[PDB]
């Protein structure tokens, strides 16, 4: 063998012609970057959603070390929260649950609630209630 194919007929694994070591090849660009933003006339601070990156390889996947300093501000920090839809940066997580207005994914939403910031939380399916049945 010299190289391996897949359903896409793309070279995913190749054999080293020198060390004869089995190794894999794959790119991780995650070009579908999304931002959660309120009305553009309301505020400038926003939250950026990264899709399926675990936000631990952000400086490595895009090589943000040699990039402009404005990209490294949102690349890492204490404002990091991980969802089932990816890692969300730029929002303060809250332990409450409201009827959300901004759909993001994986049951996580965003809002404009108070010192102002954008909060992200699991949406509230409704007001819990019980029926006095007998």
């Amino acid at each position: 063998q010299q190289f391996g194919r897949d359903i896409a007929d793309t070279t995913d694994a190749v054999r080293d012609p020198q060390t004869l070591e089995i190794l894999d090849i794959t790119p991780c660009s995650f070009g579908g970057v999304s931002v959660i933003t309120p009305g553009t006339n309301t505020s400038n601070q926003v939250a950026v959603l990264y899709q399926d990156v675990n936000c631990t390889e952000v400086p490595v996947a895009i090589h943000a070390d040699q990039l402009t300093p404005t990209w490294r501000v949102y690349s890492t920090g204490s404002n990091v929260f991980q969802t089932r839809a990816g890692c969300l940066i730029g929002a303060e997580h809250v332990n409450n649950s409201y009827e959300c207005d901004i759909p993001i994914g994986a049951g996580i939403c965003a809002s404009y609630q108070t010192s102002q910031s954008i909060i992200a939380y699991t949406m509230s399916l409704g007001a819990e209630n019980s029926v006095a049945y007998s």
Partner: protein, 48 residues
């Protein structure tokens, strides 16, 4: 850079927004507008 300049009825530019300052600025050139209601948007990746 990719610049989006808006012109008044006279043609004099009163304000301009660069589309590389922050990922918020990437939204405007992606959508080709400024005053857009609240929601969620996706911008094509442009980092090199």
């Amino acid at each position: 850079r990719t610049f989006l300049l808006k012109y008044n009825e006279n043609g004099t530019i009163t304000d301009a927004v660069d589309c590389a300052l922050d990922p918020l600025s990437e939204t405007k050139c992606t959508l080709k507008s400024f005053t857009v209601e609240k929601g969620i948007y996706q911008t094509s990746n442009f980092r090199v």
